From a paper:
Monensin A is a prototypical natural polyether polyketide antibiotic. Biosynthesis of monensin A involves construction of a polyene polyketide backbone, subsequent epoxidation of the alkenes, and, lastly, formation of cyclic ethers via epoxide-opening cyclization. MonCI, a flavin-dependent monooxygenase, is thought to transform all three alkenes in the intermediate polyketide premonensin A into epoxides. MonCI is a class A flavin-dependent monooxygenase based on its structural and biochemical features.
To elucidate the structural basis of MonCI’s catalytic activity, we determined the MonCI crystal structure at 1.9 Å resolution using the multi-wavelength anomalous diffraction method. Two molecules of MonCI are present in the crystal asymmetric unit (chain A and B). One FAD coenzyme and one chloride ion were found in each chain. MonCI consists of a β-strand-rich substrate-binding domain located near the C-terminus and a Rossmann-like three-layer ββα sandwich FAD-binding domain located near the N-terminus. The FAD- and substrate-binding pockets are fused and form a continuous chamber that is shaped like an inverted letter L. The substrate-binding pocket, which lies immediately on top of the isoalloxazine ring of FAD, is about 40 Å long and about 25 Å wide. The volume of the fused FAD- and substrate-binding pocket of MonCI is 995 Å3, as calculated using the program CASTp 3.036. FAD is bound noncovalently to MonCI through numerous direct and solvent-mediated interactions. The chloride ion coordinates with five hydrogen bond donors (Gln52 main chain nitrogen, Ser298 side chain hydroxyl group, and three water molecules) in a distorted trigonal bipyramidal stereochemistry. In our MonCI crystal structure, the FAD is in the “in” conformation, which is the expected conformation during epoxidation.
Numbering used by the authors: 4 to 480
The structure:
Amino acid sequence: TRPAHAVVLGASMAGTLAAHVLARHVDAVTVVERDALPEEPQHRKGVPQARHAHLLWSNGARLIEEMLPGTTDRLLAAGARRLGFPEDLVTLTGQGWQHRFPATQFALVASRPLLDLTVRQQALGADNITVRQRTEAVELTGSGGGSGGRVTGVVVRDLDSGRQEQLEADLVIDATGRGSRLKQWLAALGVPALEEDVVDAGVAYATRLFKAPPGATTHFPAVNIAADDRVREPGRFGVVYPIEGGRWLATLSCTRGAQLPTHEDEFIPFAENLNHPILADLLRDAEPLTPVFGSRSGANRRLYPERLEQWPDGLLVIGDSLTAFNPIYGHGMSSAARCATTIDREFERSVQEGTGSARAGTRALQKAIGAAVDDPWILAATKDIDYVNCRVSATDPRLIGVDTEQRLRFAEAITAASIRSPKASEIVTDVMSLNAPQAELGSNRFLMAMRADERLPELTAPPFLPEELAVVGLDAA
Ligand SMILES: Cc1cc2nc3c(=O)[nH]c(=O)nc-3n(C[C@H](O)[C@H](O)[C@H](O)COP(=O)(O)OP(=O)(O)OC[C@H]3O[C@@H](n4cnc5c(N)ncnc54)[C@H](O)[C@@H]3O)c2cc1C
Ligand SMILES: [Cl-]
């Protein structure tokens, strides 16, 4: 019959959105979060990735705005910036500088603690949501393996008292992120292993927070620098994003085989060694506020519970626990929002009575969630699969059934069109913002746009406007 109590494990972006949506369809929702959740925008140990630059692409932003009206204005009122693409970015691709065409998509940029707080404030206020902070999910309860498995609840431990308690539930949602213990919980119930795809280019991140030149966060673009991506060499990248409070977040990254800064005096020289040194020129006199923070969470990985015949009833997996991506493409929060939107749109259809058990509904929900995360998976995996020394363990025929040399040729063509042809840039910006599938770049429509559109002359300098150079006090020469 119909769920009366849902338990959500984890209260970051995926779990907070999921709890909001589930409270609309289920009598009572409990949220279990290991951290204390701050009432001010502060970093916390359970989301260490929030130290690094975050873009909320228009796909995720619109889905959050639909679920939680007013959120976008609250973010802008608190200093977030709406960055139009490509218009508001100075971007060097492996094919040249991006012409700054009038924006066709956007992303919201704020410090990740402000985004998270603003969302929580909107989403966890409902009267039928109970948030248990400083509480750790320990294992799942129920039975697994052949025929009739079901999850009936969760063992939780209060971290202040050390006391463990059994939390019964009709539906359990794992939103505990890339560090989820899900595989261990499933093995303990007797559930067989999940199918999983990996495309792991060994990407790593190094980030410093800076005080920006006054006014740069409002009147100076974001800047994104990529390698010429010589076929046999690791990629190296850098981005500088404005966030609230007149600060710049600078995130440097590379793929397997290149070295990232780990000491502060190594940071600007890495940016100096990118294909164009502009990031170093911008940061050279900016005031650093933090040491270098690192991340090694850069692999693309995807679990396929929707394929497991022995998936247990009453269990859903969402967010980074289900699938996680190379952060350079910026889709994890959008993918989290898609998971919650999909639950919202499919919950009633899936749980309609008639089958006599929760199996049909659980499996139908997890199958719809699986379809919803396909776009960020195939985008990021396609972009990473041909890096030198990339580790590929995937069954996806879109990836493993195609000629590598053909894919490389396709990719250069798409990039070359996007930077200098406005009609191509619209379609590519749609895909890069997670609003059209990667498959659209192989369509008749896109190929025709690539062929028929004008192509502007190559840019020979970063396309800053004069008013922008004035802000940071640089000279075109
Ligand atoms: C370097 C880097 C840069 C990124 N940049 C971007 C970007 O630009 N744009 C974007 O959209 N995404 C970006 N991402 C991805 C984004 O951070 C995540 O997709 C997003 O946080 C959603 O993840 P989540 O809610 O599923 O899990 P997480 O955010 O990882 O949170 C999981 C939650 O579960 C809690 N938890 C864990 N274990 C337990 C337990 N046993 N019991 C209870 N609670 C538990 C944790 O404390 C945490 O609150 C980036 C990621 C990284 C690493
Ligand atoms: Cl991290």
